[PDB]
Amino acid sequence: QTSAVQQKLAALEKSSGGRLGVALIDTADNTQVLYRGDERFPMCSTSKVMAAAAVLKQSETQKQLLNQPVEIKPADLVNYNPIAEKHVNGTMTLAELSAAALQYADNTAMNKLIAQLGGPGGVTAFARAIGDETFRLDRTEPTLNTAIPGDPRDTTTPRAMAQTLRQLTLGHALGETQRAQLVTWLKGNTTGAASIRAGLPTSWTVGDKTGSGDYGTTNDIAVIWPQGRAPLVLVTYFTQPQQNAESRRDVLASAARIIAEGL
Ligand SMILES: [K+]
């Protein structure tokens, strides 16, 4: 089958010169609308949601865990550390690290979450534990963002990520307090204004996590509450042929608009 939303997503893709993947879940009627929805895409920073959620899950049994101070040493600093670089030779809590990773895309913070989970395999392990058999996290920051065409490392599919984000933010993969914290974190993201949120009616409330990497990889995953009606989950992944391709957040805004117009 091929819906007219798919016809406009395909044209958007052709216009873009890149590879677009989209997956929407309408919770109201549990319907799904997908474009290259089973192809793999580099997740880039959108993988931080899985790592933050995995640490929240540990916090269900370890009740003070989010309050635990974690040292920031000079050697922990990587390529983009907007919050952590302010605390080197001091400490940050796992809550602070989670907020820095999710809301400011801090790669040092992500690496602290990965370390708390025992390595990238501990993030993948949480994905398998909540039903996601597609997600794979293989590297730490910054190398998980190489987004090399054909490389299965650090990839998921639009379908799998939208199903997972639903479970974490709207379902009960997490404890209620942990889910609420994740939602609070996602809603306060500072990096998404030009991506999914830019394609959506202003009155809709959004939580999202962006991602960016080599090959112009430009991603966003969002939980959407559109006032009146039931929430939506939308993932938009985009990647391009040239390793040094520029960011294309507009494509994600545009995919989101097409998806919103087809409701
Ligand atoms: K980042």
- Catalytic, 254? Answer no
| Sequence-distant (≥ 6) Cβ neighbours of residue 131 within 8 angstroms | 163, 164, 167, 173
Nearest-angstrom CA–CA distance, 159 and 68: 34
DSSP character string of 66-101: GG-EEEE-GGG--S--TTGGGSTTEEEEHHHHHHHH
Task: Report which secondary-structure segment, H or E, holds 237.
Answer: strand 232-239
Strand partners, 235: 23, 221
Instruction: Find the catalytic residue in 15, 16, 45, 247.
Output: 45
Tokens of 93: 């809590």
Nearest-angstrom CA–CA distance, 196 and 178: 24
The closest of 29, 24, 18, 27 to 158, measured between CA atoms, is 24
The closest of 182, 187, 180, 178 to 205, measured between CA atoms, is 187
- Report resolution in angstroms: 1.6
Ligand 1 centroid, distance to 80 Cα (angstroms): 6
Tokens of 94: 């796992």
Ligand 1 centroid, distance to 71 Cα (angstroms): 20
Report yes or no: 179 and 110 within 8 Å, Cβ to Cβ. Answer: no
Tokens of 247: 């960011």
Q: Is 115 exposed, middle or buried (0-12, 13-18, 19+ CB in 10 A)?
A: middle
Ligand 1 centroid, distance to 240 Cα (angstroms): 18
* Residue 132, SS3 per DSSP: coil
Letter string b/e over residues 153-189, b meaning 16 or more CB atoms within 10 A of that residue's CB: bbbbbbbbbbbbbbbbbbeebbeeebbebbbebbeeb
The closest of 17, 102, 4, 104 to 51, measured between CA atoms, is 102
Ligand 1 centroid, distance to 4 Cα (angstroms): 34
Ligand 1 centroid, distance to 228 Cα (angstroms): 33
Domain that holds residue 160: 4-261
Nearest-angstrom CA–CA distance, 217 and 186: 20
Q: Maximum distance among all alpha carbons in the chain?
A: 57
- Experimentally, how was this structure solved? X-ray
How many domains are there within the chain? 1
Residue 69: CATH number of its domain: 3.40.710.10
Tokens of 6: 């798919």
Nearest-angstrom CA–CA distance, 51 and 154: 12
